[PDB]
């Protein structure tokens, strides 16, 4: 129930051991058919993520950009969700102004990041309409998405277990299990998850499955 995390390769981790989650969130390194200073996952690697086993009833927050506006919609569909909202993060500078200059998009400049909101099954105990679908926040440090999204999700679905894919050390927090290759080792607290992790990885090495 305090912060929990697993350093891992998202493509290889047997995510069936973590149980079910009321909220799933991912800010993935989409292959956006552009030159990037970090590694990406192919479209097929993204489609094949075992998102469906993480949840029977609940919400998905999927950050998207570029051609992943459409590929993210296809993933939502493949993983069993309907899209019911779309949040944007409007980026401001230190004077709370929009930075309008540069060449920050292919055709128009880009002032926001998009997050698809999907629903699966028939969730209960959620509070609809507490937050707006527009986030206004400065770009801070290494952040790729704004920290405000965690408060919105917690107000939407308080007290439920949540899981984040492709998360970073800064993102670990109560009620969340954070998965990502930049995390420091493995820190599990939920005794149910610990038991299943030991049964599946008898010696702690989360390696590619024996094909």
């Amino acid at each position: 129930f305090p912060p929990q995390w697993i350093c891992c390769d998202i493509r290889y981790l047997d995510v069936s051991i973590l149980g079910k989650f009321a909220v799933v969130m991912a800010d993935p390194p989409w292959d956006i058919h552009m030159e990037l200073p970090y590694g990406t996952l192919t479209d097929d690697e993204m489609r094949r993520l075992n998102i469906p086993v993480l949840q029977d009833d609940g919400f998905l927050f999927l950050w998207v950009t570029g051609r992943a506006m459409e590929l993210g919609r296809e993933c939502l569909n493949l993983w069993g969700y309907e899209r019911v909202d779309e949040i944007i993060w409007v980026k401001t500078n230190q004077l709370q102004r929009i930075i309008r200059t540069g060449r920050t998009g292919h055709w128009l400049n880009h002032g926001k990041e998009h997050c698809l909101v999907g629903v699966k099954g028939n969730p209960q105990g959620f509070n609809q309409g507490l937050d707006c679908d527009v986030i206004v926040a400065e770009v801070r440090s290494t952040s790729h998405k704004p920290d405000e999204i965690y408060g919105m999700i917690e107000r939407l679905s308080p007290g439920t277990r949540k899981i984040e894919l492709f998360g970073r050390p800064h993102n670990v927090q109560p009620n969340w299990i954070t998965l990502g290759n930049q995390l420091d080792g493995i820190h599990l607290l939920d005794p149910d998850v610990v038991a299943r992790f030991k049964q599946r990885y008898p010696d702690g090495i989360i390696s590619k499955p024996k094909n």
Binding site: F59, M69, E70, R73, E82, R83, V84, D85, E86, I87, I88, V90, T92, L95, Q96, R97, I98, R100, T101, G102, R103, T104, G105, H106, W107, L108, N109, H110, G111, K112, H114, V117, V119, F126, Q128, G129, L130, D131, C132, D133, V134, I135, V136, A137, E138, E148, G151, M152, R155, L156
Partner: protein
């Protein structure tokens, strides 16, 4: 810093209320070179603008091929049933919208700007773009502030957040290369956001800034506004819609403004070529 999401929960003031310096006319008052680029481009638009042209038509029944010549940009705001949730004119389902034969009037290289609302249209408008032969290439969000009326003013379908924006999807048809086609587009002159105050109830107009973004971006002079109204009639545009009270469109006269000795393109001055954003040498 402060959490403006929490501030909204506490106060009803939307986060976008605290973005500074959003006004269209007053935009670059403190940024003289940016102001000059916009001013020169608007002057270039005004110099080449056709006089206002408009046609009353029942777009559902109309043979859309009667609109000639081909269009470099098309702006479409079909009246969605979600805009009225007090209907007056015919409301359009996304099936109705998809049936429009847009590909029959769009130029071989051209752009479309489709107001999609904030619900199912974000998905179904993309299907329309596919059908019409465009690729979705930008998403212009109209963000609405509620400075005048805080603050819980909602709600429509299966939403879970309060919806405070509308999306205008931009599509591209044909091949356009930013490296070689600077006589057709000026990229990166505007950003994909418009920020204004929530209009009065029952006012369904979209922000006039959408025209500025389109006119700055594409140098094609043949501009069609489908489902425009009397109040959107504008030089440089052909406005077509059922609620227009009068018509002056003559397809031959309209076409003559773009044919020899004229061009369907605005051209450009040396001063604008030196100010507008361009890629560096390879």
């Amino acid at each position: 810093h402060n959490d403006y999401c929490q501030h909204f929960v506490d106060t009803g003031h939307r986060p976008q209320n605290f973005i500074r310096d959003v006004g269209l006319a007053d935009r670059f008052e403190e940024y003289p070179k940016l102001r000059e680029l916009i001013r020169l481009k608007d002057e270039l638009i005004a110099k080449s603008n056709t006089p206002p042209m408009y046609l009353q038509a029942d777009i559902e029944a109309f043979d859309i091929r009667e609109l000639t010549p081909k269009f470099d940009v098309i702006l479409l705001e079909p009246p969605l049933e979600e805009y009225y949730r007090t209907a007056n004119e015919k409301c359009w389902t996304w099936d109705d919208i998809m049936k429009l034969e847009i590909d029959e009037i769009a130029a071989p290289r051209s752009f479309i700007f489709l107001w999609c609302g904030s619900g199912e249209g974000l998905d179904l408008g993309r299907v329309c773009l596919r059908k019409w032969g465009y690729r979705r290439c930008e998403d212009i969000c109209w963000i609405k502030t509620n400075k005048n009326n805080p603050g819980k003013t909602t709600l429509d379908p299966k939403a879970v957040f309060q919806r405070t924006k509308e999306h205008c999807l931009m599509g591209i048809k044909g091949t356009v290369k930013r490296s070689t086609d600077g006589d057709f587009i000026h990229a990166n002159v505007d950003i994909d956001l418009i920020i204004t105050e929530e209009p009065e109830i029952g006012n369904i107009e979209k922000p006039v800034e959408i025209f500025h973004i389109i006119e700055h971006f594409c140098l094609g002079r043949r501009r069609l506004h489908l489902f425009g109204r009397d109040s959107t009639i504008r030089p440089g545009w052909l406005t077509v819609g059922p609620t227009l009270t009068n018509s002056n469109y003559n397809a031959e006269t309209y076409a003559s403004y773009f044919s020899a000795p004229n061009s369907y393109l605005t051209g450009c001055t040396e001063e604008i070529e030196r100010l507008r954003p361009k890629s560096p040498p390879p």
